[PDB]
């Protein structure tokens, strides 16, 4: 799941969480009118792309900076005209950049205090946990390194729900004072309820702070979603932005195949997540670089094999393919048949190293043998990895 800045903040504001008032514009004129409607003393214009570093990015129009500040609505429209339709290149994008179709026109807010606040499921404590620090605007992982005494945790009981004492105590530990502490405690409760409602794995607000005018605001936030809960989060998952994803990963998502593109030249699809991780491991240990991670699940069907091959063609770095299949009550001869079928029909001539363990192996070896295709049948996983590495440069 990937949400734009305006998508996540809309999701937060709809659930009582305080964020900057904002509009989203498709055109320069929409941005102009949105700027007027805000009635804000200062406006911030933000290009909407998923990658970071927008502030120091450059547009293909020549405009420097994807984040601009102004008190003039007309300037907002002018700058938006130099953003929308163009590509935004940052230090976290390809040099070509990413096409900007929408901009955010938000009320610019000053920040007096910056804190860190995160809500996630604690695998060890079996339930939601509040993670906070008075040191905000910083990668929290570094704070844990230098100053572990500044990381505060609150274990939440999922049935009991978040307690007022818990929300208040965290707000105090974050450094909020007086009415700002009460306002922060309330927002924490709203953030917790949002966390549960949208089936998030984590809701991370950074910075979680306050304006000089004395209001607690979630200035920036990141939301990670539980993929298992898509069936009951249809509206949210429909907002998914795949424009900054690896194209092969996107096509794999269509066929429900777990693909993660890598840096190597040895492609491999494997039934099972652990076995696939182990395959990448043992390929590396024998001096090779895996081109990808590809899990088909324990129940490996023939069509999944075909789609996998279809995916691996889109990767030009692929010089060899390691096929390792153990398990799933679809016999090996059927798998082997689907392998030969995909090889001829997809016009593939990279060498295959295939290890099949199950039933009808001898028949599978036969189907592989008389296929007249560059297919090597390995006996074990180490043998397969070595023969795959030997197949490439």
């Amino acid at each position: 799941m990937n949400l734009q800045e305006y998508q996540s903040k809309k999701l937060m504001s709809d659930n009582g969480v305080k964020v900057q008032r904002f509009f989203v514009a498709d055109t320069a004129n929409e941005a102009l009118e949105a700027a007027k409607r805000l009635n804000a003393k200062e406006i911030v214009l933000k290009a909407q792309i998923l990658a970071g570093g927008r502030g120091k990015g450059v547009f293909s129009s020549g405009l420097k900076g994807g984040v601009h500040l102004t008190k003039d609505p007309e300037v907002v429209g002018q700058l938006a005209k130099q953003m929308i339709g163009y590509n935004l290149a940052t230090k976290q994008t390809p040099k070509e950049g990413v096409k900007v179709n929408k901009v955010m026109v938000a009320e610019a807010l000053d920040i007096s205090r910056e804190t860190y606040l995160a809500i996630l499921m604690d695998r060890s404590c079996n339930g939601p946990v509040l993670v906070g620090s008075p040191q905000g605007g910083v990668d929290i992982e570094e704070v844990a390194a230098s100053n572990p005494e500044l990381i505060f945790k609150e274990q939440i009981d999922i049935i009991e729900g978040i307690k007022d004492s818990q929300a208040q105590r965290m707000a105090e530990n974050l450094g909020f004072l007086g009415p700002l502490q009460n306002q922060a405690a309330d927002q924490i409760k709203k953030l917790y309820n949002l966390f549960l409602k949208i089936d998030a794995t984590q809701v991370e607000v950074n910075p979680f702070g306050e304006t000089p005018e004395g209001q607690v605001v979630c200035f920036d936030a990141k939301i990670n979603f539980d993929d298992n809960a898509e069936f009951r989060q249809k509206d949210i998952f429909a907002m998914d932005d795949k424009s900054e994803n690896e194209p092969i990963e996107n096509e794999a998502a269509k066929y429900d195949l777990k693909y993660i593109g890598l840096d190597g030249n040895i492609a491999c699809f494997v039934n099972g997540a652990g076995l696939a991780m182990a395959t990448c491991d043992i390929i590396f240990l024998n001096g090779g670089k895996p081109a990808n991670f590809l899990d088909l699940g324990g129940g490996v069907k023939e069509s999944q094999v075909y789609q996998a091959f279809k995916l691996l063609t889109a990767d030009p770095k692929v010089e060899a393919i390691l096929v390792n299949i153990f398990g799933g009550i679809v016999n090996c001869a059927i798998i082997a048949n689907g392998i030969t079928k995909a090889c001829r029909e997809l016009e593939l001539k990279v060498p295959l190293v295939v290890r099949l363990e199950g039933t009808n192996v001898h028949e599978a070896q036969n189907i592989l043998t008389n296929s007249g295709l560059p297919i090597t049948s390995a006996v074990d996983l180490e043998d397969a990895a070595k023969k795959a590495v030997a197949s490439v440069t």
Binding site: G127, I158, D226, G272, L275, F293, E357, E382
Partner: protein, 303 residues
């Protein structure tokens, strides 16, 4: 205490099993395979389908009725993700000794709620979800694993990975060691059984003379396992433990297939798990293809 239900992990020829999601596609197929293997499958449940027979076995509307009419001691769940957590809860409510949930795709929040109930009782032991199951070779098979690569023997196997299990099983069969008990705990971040739960059983089991522990990135179950081994597998009759941890080359911030297999915030790395286990006296196999030969070296070194 929930730790009291650990003994229910050890299925045998006296284990009687019902199937929740009995009339479903996968529920039917693996029930047929269970009957082939010799597993005492005695019936199953499907809400609204009670009063019928399926595969020559009675179908019930509820777990409680299924348990009372069959005397079942174990339940296996092939219920779709939107309703699987409720199926687990019904099984816990009926106080079924052992519950094996196969279902992949249960919302993590659902399982957090399930675990809340699970940890506050001691009658029901849960394996899974997103797990292959458990097998006592030649005696009882509950789950997905192929039972013909198995061989009744001396090595206890516990794994967060189903397909890596099949590697460890096949290798231990090849070198003639065989398996005493094999447990797949699944690849979900919130489950009913971890490594230490099985290690407890393995250590107390006379039939178990060696242990293969298969882990991967994400969570701290491997680290907890290492701590448990330092305290409980330290003489005078300590059993050899061989391990393999997948994901040495896994990238950070990505869910590597399994929902629980992810490196986030610098935690969950494979190298730290390897280090922790080695410090606990575990022989960590660098290669997944050498689990059998490695545990063989340790086993014969037991003079």
């Amino acid at each position: 205490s929930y730790t009291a239900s650990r003994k229910h992990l050890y299925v045998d020829k006296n284990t009687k099993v019902i199937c929740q999601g009995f009339t479903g596609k996968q529920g039917t197929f693996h029930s047929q395979q269970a009957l082939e293997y010799g597993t005492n499958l005695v019936g199953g449940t499907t809400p609204g389908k009670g009063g019928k027979t399926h595969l020559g076995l009675p179908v019930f509307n509820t777990v409680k009725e299924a348990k009372e009419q069959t005397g079942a001691t174990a339940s296996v769940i092939y219920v779709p993700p939107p309703f699987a957590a409720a199926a687990i809860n019904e099984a816990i409510d009926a106080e079924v000794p052992l519950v094996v949930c196969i279902t992949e795709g249960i919302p993590q929040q659902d399982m957090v709620r399930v675990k809340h109930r699970l940890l506050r009782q001691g009658k029901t032991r849960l394996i899974g979800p997103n797990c292959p199951g458990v097998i006592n070779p030649g005696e009882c098979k509950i789950g997905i694993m192929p039972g013909h690569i198995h061989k009744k023997g001396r090595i206890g196997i516990v794994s967060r990975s189903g397909t890596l299990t099949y590697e460890a099983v096949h290798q231990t069969t090849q070198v003639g060691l065989g398996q005493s008990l094999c447990v797949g705990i699944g690849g979900d971040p919130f489950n009913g059984t971890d490594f230490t739960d099985c290690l407890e059983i393995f250590l107390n089991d006379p039939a178990t003379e060696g242990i293969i522990l298969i882990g991967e990135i994400g969570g701290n179950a491997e680290e907890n396992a290492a701590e448990f081994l330092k305290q409980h597998n330290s003489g005078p009759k300590s059993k050899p433990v061989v391990s393999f941890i997948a994901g040495l080359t896994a990238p950070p911030g990505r869910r590597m297939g399994h929902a629980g297999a992810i490196i986030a915030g610098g935690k969950g790395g494979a190298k730290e798990k390897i280090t922790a286990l080695q410090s606990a006296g575990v022989v960590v196999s660098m290669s997944p293809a050498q689990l059998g030969t490695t545990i063989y070296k340790e086993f014969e070194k037991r003079k």
